[PDB]
Amino acid sequence: TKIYRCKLTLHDNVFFASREMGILYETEKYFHNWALSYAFFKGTIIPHPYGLVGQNAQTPAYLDRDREQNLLHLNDSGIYVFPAQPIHWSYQINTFKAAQSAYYGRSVQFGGKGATKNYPINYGRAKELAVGSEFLTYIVSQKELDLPVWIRLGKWSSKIRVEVEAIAPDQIKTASGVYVCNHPLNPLDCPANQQILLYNRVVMPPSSLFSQSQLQGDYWQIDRNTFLPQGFHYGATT
Amino acid sequence: MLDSLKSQFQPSFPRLASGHYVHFLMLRHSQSFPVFQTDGVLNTTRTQAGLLEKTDQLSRLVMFKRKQTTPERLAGRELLRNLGLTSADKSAKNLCEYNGEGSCKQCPDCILYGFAIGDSGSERSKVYSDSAFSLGAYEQSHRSFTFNAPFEGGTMSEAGVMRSAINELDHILPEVTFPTVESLRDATYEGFIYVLGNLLRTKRYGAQESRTGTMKNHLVGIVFADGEIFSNLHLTQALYDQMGGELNKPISELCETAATVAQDLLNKEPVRKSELIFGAHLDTLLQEVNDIYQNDAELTKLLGSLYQQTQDYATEFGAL
Amino acid sequence: MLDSLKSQFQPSFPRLASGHYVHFLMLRHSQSFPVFQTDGVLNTTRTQAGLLEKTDQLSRLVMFKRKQTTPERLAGRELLRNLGLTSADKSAKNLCEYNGEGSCKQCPDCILYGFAIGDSGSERSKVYSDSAFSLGAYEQSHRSFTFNAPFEGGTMSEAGVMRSAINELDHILPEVTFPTVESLRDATYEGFIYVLGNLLRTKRYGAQESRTGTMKNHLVGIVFADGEIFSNLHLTQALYDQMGGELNKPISELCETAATVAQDLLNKEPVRKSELIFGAHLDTLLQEVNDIYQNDAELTKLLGSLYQQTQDYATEFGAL
DNA sequence: CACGTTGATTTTT
DNA sequence: ACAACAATCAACGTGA
């Protein structure tokens, strides 16, 4: 029922380890929906356990009712964030290191002696999304929503200004047919009574998004040049 | 002061994050030539000069979260080793090592700044932070200094051949200010004294800290809130605009103008705020924490309790 | 004094910082026209003139970072060679090449002041130093002197043509004073005697040592500490304010003014202070250390012990 | 997991 | 007159 046009401005550089090639780790230019859903609603709705230990410390709980860090809490809260479209962007490639806390340091080869386990020993280069960037998302909810005007994202918990407007009922309209979505859209969240006819894809962990799609189903023309899929909810394909 | 604030904090570390944030508002003032570099240059980004609707872009120096958090973090671990709460010896039962498998799961550093071993445990950082920015432009805020390394016999030549050991290096200037908000979630009272300790007790940052890089962390306010208040960039763009770009001002005018800009911003940001420690209440609070960090009995007591609380969190809710 | 101070130090060098800073508070007074340059002019920076009262901007000279650690470092190395603990001949088992491969990785210079070239790793300097600032403004504190170079025939021509070998250079005036804190981390007692020896035994600093740049280091305090005290710039800005900018005072009154501002500032630092050697206790200790450096048996023993300490650190935790 | 081992590229008026 | 640096930062295989 309610729809919020939220534009995200980076107030410091955002890193996600989306792909890795040698010394270089890089960030995809679309913020994945599930990452933004926890950035908005973790602590307010979804639980935020400070510690983990066990299998729960390296296995996601995305869509597992048995665990506390679910995105399904939000299905029951009647809320859905869409993934983020880049409106304006830049990248910085910045090195990062391991600290030499001891007075003496030996450069050790990764996998050598004293280095035989997967940890960030030595150095790497992160291709971060930079302060010079702006992204656009939509949140759809069935209740007026107290959205936080600051969020944190990614590998380094980096600040985003969220400036948000509710799209009023005088300028949205509801319809059904074939439509080009033109915003990003997560295929895992697609229900029955939507079908995807065409898509162009952005290959990305944890699951690939569409950057552009043609759908058949119900939609909201939220301004005269974008069409948002109606009825999407977290994990609806399962 | 501290006797009144003891109500605000959690009585012991919670499992889930509850949304109590104590925010430290600071100006980090450069005192001698820091070098916040990666990739062989001083880190910079283009930004808008200020919040009042400028066309005007400005290259400002960026101190990344790593470059400020790790110097605070490591200055806590050496304090805990000096109090004898943790050890450097591989044969001790209270060993803690900074990054590998040998990280503790109990000590104050591990619970407040976090750890990740793998399946054997991990803990999220309770100290939230942002990348800090120079209040002025890079062109105003740096100078490049030559270095050389001759033979001990005083000469760039040895055996009639020249050393290649000359280059330039880039340095930030001795008055450059980096407005900062550091934020601490869901902390106990002693957790606040440990972290506020790091902010006041650590004094060197960036590369070549053996030779350079002293900074003065001037605390400007402490703010208790239900949520995240504003970014370093947003404070810096507000502070530039409150000055209209006359950046050539003394440290005390720059701190008092930051204290009123912080309160101008806090009135607009939609989170509820329990306490706003500024001015003479901050200067008495700072004296009352300086009095802990100068007293052997008082500090070993508080940090002993912190240890216990974090050792109890570890065994009750943490990585056991 | 030395009989009690011995207890504060560690019995051998650790691999990790265990608190235990010793801070050497000094005034470095110019005696014979120092040249402190990079990029062909005397190094200078704009600073607030003093902390609280005299809040106007002022340019002051900068004794930049290594200009106050390479003199110390090299003077200690020629003592290690004089005592025969290290050598400068190739094909001797105790060679130590300065700033190359073939650095010893075991001698007191290699451990206390650090190394980073070639295989066998890198070592962080246990002496922490910082860039020092002139207490006065540049304008009252420098002069430009013409130099020329004729032919040995006593004239600027050898065939009727001119040599034109004429140029200016800027030199810092005598009695110009640079307040500074040198800091030593995790020393043994013999390591303190070595570093303190360098500070009292060095006397030339700038460019053109062969002709210029003598200085007088007056140690004004030694402070045992749980962590970093104030920056060089902060002690300078405090000392200028205490004099009101009236800097034409004798060196005895200036060393006594530095002593009272350093003690005022130390009582505002979040640092447990184990020992605070000043005044009549410091001019006791300085004599008890002069008695080491004037005695051939005592110095050989002490610095020989240091060699063992630093060679054992090397085999136990360092370069093996 | 804990022992052991040691070759490769082609060039910026 | 003449230097603009210098090093270090695996990739497997085999047996227990």
PDB file of C-alpha atoms in Angstrom, chain C residues 18-227:
ATOM      1  CA  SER C  18      53.684  -3.762  27.315  1.00  0.00           C
ATOM      2  CA  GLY C  19      52.915  -0.090  28.106  1.00  0.00           C
ATOM      3  CA  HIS C  20      56.165   1.204  29.700  1.00  0.00           C
ATOM      4  CA  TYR C  21      56.967   4.423  27.848  1.00  0.00           C
ATOM      5  CA  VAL C  22      59.828   6.623  29.038  1.00  0.00           C
ATOM      6  CA  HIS C  23      59.463  10.218  27.789  1.00  0.00           C
ATOM      7  CA  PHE C  24      62.536  12.470  27.470  1.00  0.00           C
ATOM      8  CA  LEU C  25      61.383  16.121  27.642  1.00  0.00           C
ATOM      9  CA  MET C  26      64.040  18.350  25.954  1.00  0.00           C
ATOM     10  CA  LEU C  27      64.744  21.827  24.748  1.00  0.00           C
ATOM     11  CA  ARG C  28      67.168  21.778  21.786  1.00  0.00           C
ATOM     12  CA  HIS C  29      68.860  25.232  21.686  1.00  0.00           C
ATOM     13  CA  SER C  30      70.696  26.315  18.503  1.00  0.00           C
ATOM     14  CA  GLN C  31      74.374  27.172  19.034  1.00  0.00           C
ATOM     15  CA  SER C  32      75.855  27.687  15.534  1.00  0.00           C
ATOM     16  CA  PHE C  33      73.566  28.420  12.587  1.00  0.00           C
ATOM     17  CA  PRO C  34      71.632  25.166  11.855  1.00  0.00           C
ATOM     18  CA  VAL C  35      70.244  24.532   8.364  1.00  0.00           C
ATOM     19  CA  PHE C  36      67.000  22.505   8.500  1.00  0.00           C
ATOM     20  CA  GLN C  37      65.919  22.079   4.905  1.00  0.00           C
ATOM     21  CA  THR C  38      64.081  19.959   2.369  1.00  0.00           C
ATOM     22  CA  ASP C  39      63.195  21.400  -1.103  1.00  0.00           C
ATOM     23  CA  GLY C  40      65.878  24.141  -0.856  1.00  0.00           C
ATOM     24  CA  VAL C  41      64.418  26.486   1.850  1.00  0.00           C
ATOM     25  CA  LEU C  42      64.161  26.354   5.652  1.00  0.00           C
ATOM     26  CA  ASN C  43      61.182  24.254   6.623  1.00  0.00           C
ATOM     27  CA  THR C  44      58.360  26.295   8.185  1.00  0.00           C
ATOM     28  CA  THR C  45      54.651  25.873   8.988  1.00  0.00           C
ATOM     29  CA  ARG C  46      51.769  28.109  10.075  1.00  0.00           C
ATOM     30  CA  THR C  47      50.578  27.452  13.616  1.00  0.00           C
ATOM     31  CA  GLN C  48      48.582  29.162  16.325  1.00  0.00           C
ATOM     32  CA  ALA C  49      51.089  31.107  18.445  1.00  0.00           C
ATOM     33  CA  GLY C  50      49.885  29.684  21.810  1.00  0.00           C
ATOM     34  CA  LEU C  51      47.105  27.532  23.326  1.00  0.00           C
ATOM     35  CA  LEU C  52      44.740  29.883  25.245  1.00  0.00           C
ATOM     36  CA  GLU C  53      45.677  33.601  25.330  1.00  0.00           C
ATOM     37  CA  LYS C  54      47.746  34.586  22.270  1.00  0.00           C
ATOM     38  CA  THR C  55      45.485  32.912  19.655  1.00  0.00           C
ATOM     39  CA  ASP C  56      46.942  34.497  16.427  1.00  0.00           C
ATOM     40  CA  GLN C  57      48.662  32.564  13.584  1.00  0.00           C
ATOM     41  CA  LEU C  58      52.451  32.543  13.252  1.00  0.00           C
ATOM     42  CA  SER C  59      54.981  30.739  10.991  1.00  0.00           C
ATOM     43  CA  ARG C  60      57.519  28.669  12.966  1.00  0.00           C
ATOM     44  CA  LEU C  61      60.530  26.642  11.821  1.00  0.00           C
ATOM     45  CA  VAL C  62      60.214  22.843  11.641  1.00  0.00           C
ATOM     46  CA  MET C  63      63.040  20.528  12.667  1.00  0.00           C
ATOM     47  CA  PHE C  64      61.428  17.836  10.531  1.00  0.00           C
ATOM     48  CA  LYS C  65      61.142  14.216  11.621  1.00  0.00           C
ATOM     49  CA  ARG C  66      64.484  12.532  10.881  1.00  0.00           C
ATOM     50  CA  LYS C  67      66.587  15.737  11.402  1.00  0.00           C
ATOM     51  CA  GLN C  68      66.211  14.822  15.162  1.00  0.00           C
ATOM     52  CA  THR C  69      66.764  11.003  15.034  1.00  0.00           C
ATOM     53  CA  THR C  70      69.525  10.363  12.448  1.00  0.00           C
ATOM     54  CA  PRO C  71      72.099  12.396  14.470  1.00  0.00           C
ATOM     55  CA  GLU C  72      71.193  10.269  17.580  1.00  0.00           C
ATOM     56  CA  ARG C  73      71.190   7.010  15.632  1.00  0.00           C
ATOM     57  CA  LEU C  74      74.549   7.532  13.909  1.00  0.00           C
ATOM     58  CA  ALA C  75      76.235   8.776  17.131  1.00  0.00           C
ATOM     59  CA  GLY C  76      75.206   5.568  18.907  1.00  0.00           C
ATOM     60  CA  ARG C  77      76.588   3.487  15.993  1.00  0.00           C
ATOM     61  CA  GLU C  78      80.045   5.106  16.139  1.00  0.00           C
ATOM     62  CA  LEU C  79      80.056   4.342  19.908  1.00  0.00           C
ATOM     63  CA  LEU C  80      79.195   0.672  19.197  1.00  0.00           C
ATOM     64  CA  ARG C  81      82.165   0.619  16.773  1.00  0.00           C
ATOM     65  CA  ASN C  82      84.398   2.425  19.306  1.00  0.00           C
ATOM     66  CA  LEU C  83      83.539  -0.179  22.014  1.00  0.00           C
ATOM     67  CA  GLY C  84      84.208  -2.877  19.352  1.00  0.00           C
ATOM     68  CA  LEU C  85      80.692  -4.412  19.547  1.00  0.00           C
ATOM     69  CA  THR C  86      80.209  -3.718  15.766  1.00  0.00           C
ATOM     70  CA  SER C  87      82.531  -3.119  12.782  1.00  0.00           C
ATOM     71  CA  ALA C  88      82.740  -1.321   9.422  1.00  0.00           C
ATOM     72  CA  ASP C  89      85.112  -3.746   7.608  1.00  0.00           C
ATOM     73  CA  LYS C  90      83.551  -6.178   5.109  1.00  0.00           C
ATOM     74  CA  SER C  91      84.347  -9.824   6.110  1.00  0.00           C
ATOM     75  CA  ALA C  92      83.833  -9.348   9.861  1.00  0.00           C
ATOM     76  CA  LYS C  93      81.065 -11.324  11.665  1.00  0.00           C
ATOM     77  CA  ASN C  94      79.779  -8.134  13.419  1.00  0.00           C
ATOM     78  CA  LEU C  95      79.384  -5.846  10.348  1.00  0.00           C
ATOM     79  CA  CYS C  96      76.408  -3.456  10.316  1.00  0.00           C
ATOM     80  CA  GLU C  97      75.808  -1.553   7.030  1.00  0.00           C
ATOM     81  CA  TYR C  98      73.620   1.542   7.643  1.00  0.00           C
ATOM     82  CA  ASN C  99      70.396   1.566   5.542  1.00  0.00           C
ATOM     83  CA  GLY C 100      71.210  -1.523   3.394  1.00  0.00           C
ATOM     84  CA  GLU C 101      71.194  -5.251   3.249  1.00  0.00           C
ATOM     85  CA  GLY C 102      74.099  -6.252   5.569  1.00  0.00           C
ATOM     86  CA  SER C 103      72.514  -4.480   8.498  1.00  0.00           C
ATOM     87  CA  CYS C 104      73.297  -6.613  11.551  1.00  0.00           C
ATOM     88  CA  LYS C 105      69.704  -7.203  12.781  1.00  0.00           C
ATOM     89  CA  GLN C 106      71.232  -7.844  16.306  1.00  0.00           C
ATOM     90  CA  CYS C 107      73.002  -4.619  17.429  1.00  0.00           C
ATOM     91  CA  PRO C 108      71.320  -1.911  19.600  1.00  0.00           C
ATOM     92  CA  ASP C 109      70.790   0.412  16.581  1.00  0.00           C
ATOM     93  CA  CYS C 110      69.015  -2.369  14.646  1.00  0.00           C
ATOM     94  CA  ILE C 111      66.676  -3.163  17.600  1.00  0.00           C
ATOM     95  CA  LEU C 112      66.058   0.313  19.132  1.00  0.00           C
ATOM     96  CA  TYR C 113      65.906   2.380  15.891  1.00  0.00           C
ATOM     97  CA  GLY C 114      64.664  -0.366  13.463  1.00  0.00           C
ATOM     98  CA  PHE C 115      65.354  -1.768   9.936  1.00  0.00           C
ATOM     99  CA  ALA C 116      63.435  -2.550   6.695  1.00  0.00           C
ATOM    100  CA  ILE C 117      65.723  -3.475   3.714  1.00  0.00           C
ATOM    101  CA  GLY C 118      66.065  -6.942   2.120  1.00  0.00           C
ATOM    102  CA  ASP C 119      65.287 -10.449   3.374  1.00  0.00           C
ATOM    103  CA  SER C 120      65.000 -11.262   7.140  1.00  0.00           C
ATOM    104  CA  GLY C 121      62.020  -8.953   7.734  1.00  0.00           C
ATOM    105  CA  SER C 122      61.539  -5.484   9.256  1.00  0.00           C
ATOM    106  CA  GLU C 123      61.676  -4.054  12.800  1.00  0.00           C
ATOM    107  CA  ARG C 124      59.779  -1.046  14.266  1.00  0.00           C
ATOM    108  CA  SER C 125      61.704   1.721  16.048  1.00  0.00           C
ATOM    109  CA  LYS C 126      61.348   1.522  19.855  1.00  0.00           C
ATOM    110  CA  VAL C 127      62.482   5.144  19.977  1.00  0.00           C
ATOM    111  CA  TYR C 128      59.385   7.133  18.943  1.00  0.00           C
ATOM    112  CA  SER C 129      60.242  10.685  17.802  1.00  0.00           C
ATOM    113  CA  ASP C 130      58.332  13.612  16.286  1.00  0.00           C
ATOM    114  CA  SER C 131      58.982  16.830  14.254  1.00  0.00           C
ATOM    115  CA  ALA C 132      59.976  19.749  16.514  1.00  0.00           C
ATOM    116  CA  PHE C 133      58.931  23.396  16.210  1.00  0.00           C
ATOM    117  CA  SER C 134      60.656  26.723  16.899  1.00  0.00           C
ATOM    118  CA  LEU C 135      59.251  28.439  19.991  1.00  0.00           C
ATOM    119  CA  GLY C 136      59.508  31.801  18.131  1.00  0.00           C
ATOM    120  CA  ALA C 137      58.375  32.951  14.697  1.00  0.00           C
ATOM    121  CA  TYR C 138      60.486  32.385  11.564  1.00  0.00           C
ATOM    122  CA  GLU C 139      60.978  36.134  11.120  1.00  0.00           C
ATOM    123  CA  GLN C 140      62.844  36.504  14.463  1.00  0.00           C
ATOM    124  CA  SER C 141      64.619  33.137  14.067  1.00  0.00           C
ATOM    125  CA  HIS C 142      66.546  33.014  10.716  1.00  0.00           C
ATOM    126  CA  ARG C 143      68.993  34.892   8.436  1.00  0.00           C
ATOM    127  CA  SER C 144      70.117  34.564   4.792  1.00  0.00           C
ATOM    128  CA  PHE C 145      73.888  34.589   4.218  1.00  0.00           C
ATOM    129  CA  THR C 146      75.586  34.938   0.776  1.00  0.00           C
ATOM    130  CA  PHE C 147      78.283  32.388  -0.027  1.00  0.00           C
ATOM    131  CA  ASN C 148      80.756  32.518  -2.906  1.00  0.00           C
ATOM    132  CA  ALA C 149      83.578  30.316  -4.220  1.00  0.00           C
ATOM    133  CA  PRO C 150      86.544  32.015  -6.035  1.00  0.00           C
ATOM    134  CA  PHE C 151      89.431  30.279  -7.791  1.00  0.00           C
ATOM    135  CA  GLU C 152      92.410  29.585  -5.487  1.00  0.00           C
ATOM    136  CA  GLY C 153      94.083  32.608  -7.181  1.00  0.00           C
ATOM    137  CA  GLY C 154      91.793  34.707  -4.942  1.00  0.00           C
ATOM    138  CA  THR C 155      89.425  36.050  -7.647  1.00  0.00           C
ATOM    139  CA  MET C 156      86.266  35.049  -9.546  1.00  0.00           C
ATOM    140  CA  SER C 157      88.125  34.695 -12.911  1.00  0.00           C
ATOM    141  CA  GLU C 158      90.670  32.202 -14.381  1.00  0.00           C
ATOM    142  CA  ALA C 159      90.755  33.479 -18.016  1.00  0.00           C
ATOM    143  CA  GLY C 160      89.163  36.965 -17.633  1.00  0.00           C
ATOM    144  CA  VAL C 161      85.680  35.290 -17.650  1.00  0.00           C
ATOM    145  CA  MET C 162      83.528  35.282 -14.476  1.00  0.00           C
ATOM    146  CA  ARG C 163      82.911  32.216 -12.282  1.00  0.00           C
ATOM    147  CA  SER C 164      79.624  33.720 -10.963  1.00  0.00           C
ATOM    148  CA  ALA C 165      79.606  31.069  -8.156  1.00  0.00           C
ATOM    149  CA  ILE C 166      77.454  33.215  -5.766  1.00  0.00           C
ATOM    150  CA  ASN C 167      74.283  32.097  -3.864  1.00  0.00           C
ATOM    151  CA  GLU C 168      72.202  32.656  -0.700  1.00  0.00           C
ATOM    152  CA  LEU C 169      71.402  30.096   1.975  1.00  0.00           C
ATOM    153  CA  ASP C 170      69.151  30.480   5.034  1.00  0.00           C
ATOM    154  CA  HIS C 171      70.367  29.456   8.486  1.00  0.00           C
ATOM    155  CA  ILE C 172      68.537  29.413  11.836  1.00  0.00           C
ATOM    156  CA  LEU C 173      69.949  31.976  14.310  1.00  0.00           C
ATOM    157  CA  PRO C 174      71.685  30.984  17.616  1.00  0.00           C
ATOM    158  CA  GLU C 175      69.565  30.809  20.808  1.00  0.00           C
ATOM    159  CA  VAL C 176      66.523  29.577  18.760  1.00  0.00           C
ATOM    160  CA  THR C 177      64.904  26.830  20.850  1.00  0.00           C
ATOM    161  CA  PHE C 178      63.013  23.680  19.775  1.00  0.00           C
ATOM    162  CA  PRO C 179      60.924  22.015  22.562  1.00  0.00           C
ATOM    163  CA  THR C 180      60.526  18.252  21.998  1.00  0.00           C
ATOM    164  CA  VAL C 181      59.564  14.928  23.615  1.00  0.00           C
ATOM    165  CA  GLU C 182      61.556  11.839  22.581  1.00  0.00           C
ATOM    166  CA  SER C 183      59.796   8.623  23.683  1.00  0.00           C
ATOM    167  CA  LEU C 184      61.263   5.150  24.328  1.00  0.00           C
ATOM    168  CA  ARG C 185      59.071   2.056  24.466  1.00  0.00           C
ATOM    169  CA  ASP C 186      59.806  -1.295  26.098  1.00  0.00           C
ATOM    170  CA  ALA C 187      63.498  -0.638  26.885  1.00  0.00           C
ATOM    171  CA  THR C 188      65.738  -2.517  29.273  1.00  0.00           C
ATOM    172  CA  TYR C 189      67.622  -0.247  31.713  1.00  0.00           C
ATOM    173  CA  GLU C 190      70.704  -0.552  29.496  1.00  0.00           C
ATOM    174  CA  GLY C 191      68.575   0.471  26.478  1.00  0.00           C
ATOM    175  CA  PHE C 192      67.516   3.663  28.328  1.00  0.00           C
ATOM    176  CA  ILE C 193      71.204   4.427  29.055  1.00  0.00           C
ATOM    177  CA  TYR C 194      71.991   3.990  25.305  1.00  0.00           C
ATOM    178  CA  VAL C 195      69.172   6.263  24.015  1.00  0.00           C
ATOM    179  CA  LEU C 196      69.765   8.838  26.787  1.00  0.00           C
ATOM    180  CA  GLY C 197      73.469   8.626  25.928  1.00  0.00           C
ATOM    181  CA  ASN C 198      72.645   9.518  22.288  1.00  0.00           C
ATOM    182  CA  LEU C 199      70.572  12.544  23.463  1.00  0.00           C
ATOM    183  CA  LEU C 200      73.361  13.926  25.721  1.00  0.00           C
ATOM    184  CA  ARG C 201      76.341  12.846  23.498  1.00  0.00           C
ATOM    185  CA  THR C 202      75.121  14.163  20.068  1.00  0.00           C
ATOM    186  CA  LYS C 203      75.791  17.826  19.254  1.00  0.00           C
ATOM    187  CA  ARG C 204      75.351  18.375  15.414  1.00  0.00           C
ATOM    188  CA  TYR C 205      72.024  18.216  13.609  1.00  0.00           C
ATOM    189  CA  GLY C 206      71.323  20.020  10.333  1.00  0.00           C
ATOM    190  CA  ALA C 207      72.749  20.141   6.859  1.00  0.00           C
ATOM    191  CA  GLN C 208      76.480  20.877   6.541  1.00  0.00           C
ATOM    192  CA  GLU C 209      77.597  19.288   9.841  1.00  0.00           C
ATOM    193  CA  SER C 210      81.235  19.801   8.809  1.00  0.00           C
ATOM    194  CA  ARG C 211      80.776  23.597   9.103  1.00  0.00           C
ATOM    195  CA  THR C 212      77.532  24.207  11.030  1.00  0.00           C
ATOM    196  CA  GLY C 213      74.635  23.084  13.108  1.00  0.00           C
ATOM    197  CA  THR C 214      75.778  22.563  16.656  1.00  0.00           C
ATOM    198  CA  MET C 215      72.977  22.427  19.259  1.00  0.00           C
ATOM    199  CA  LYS C 216      72.627  22.163  23.064  1.00  0.00           C
ATOM    200  CA  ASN C 217      70.106  19.598  24.293  1.00  0.00           C
ATOM    201  CA  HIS C 218      68.840  20.486  27.773  1.00  0.00           C
ATOM    202  CA  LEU C 219      66.861  17.576  29.129  1.00  0.00           C
ATOM    203  CA  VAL C 220      64.120  19.267  31.224  1.00  0.00           C
ATOM    204  CA  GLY C 221      62.312  16.089  32.409  1.00  0.00           C
ATOM    205  CA  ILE C 222      62.132  12.269  32.155  1.00  0.00           C
ATOM    206  CA  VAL C 223      58.587  10.817  32.679  1.00  0.00           C
ATOM    207  CA  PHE C 224      57.875   7.091  33.129  1.00  0.00           C
ATOM    208  CA  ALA C 225      54.387   6.483  31.715  1.00  0.00           C
ATOM    209  CA  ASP C 226      51.433   4.318  30.802  1.00  0.00           C
ATOM    210  CA  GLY C 227      51.193   5.758  27.248  1.00  0.00           C
TER     211      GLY C 227
END
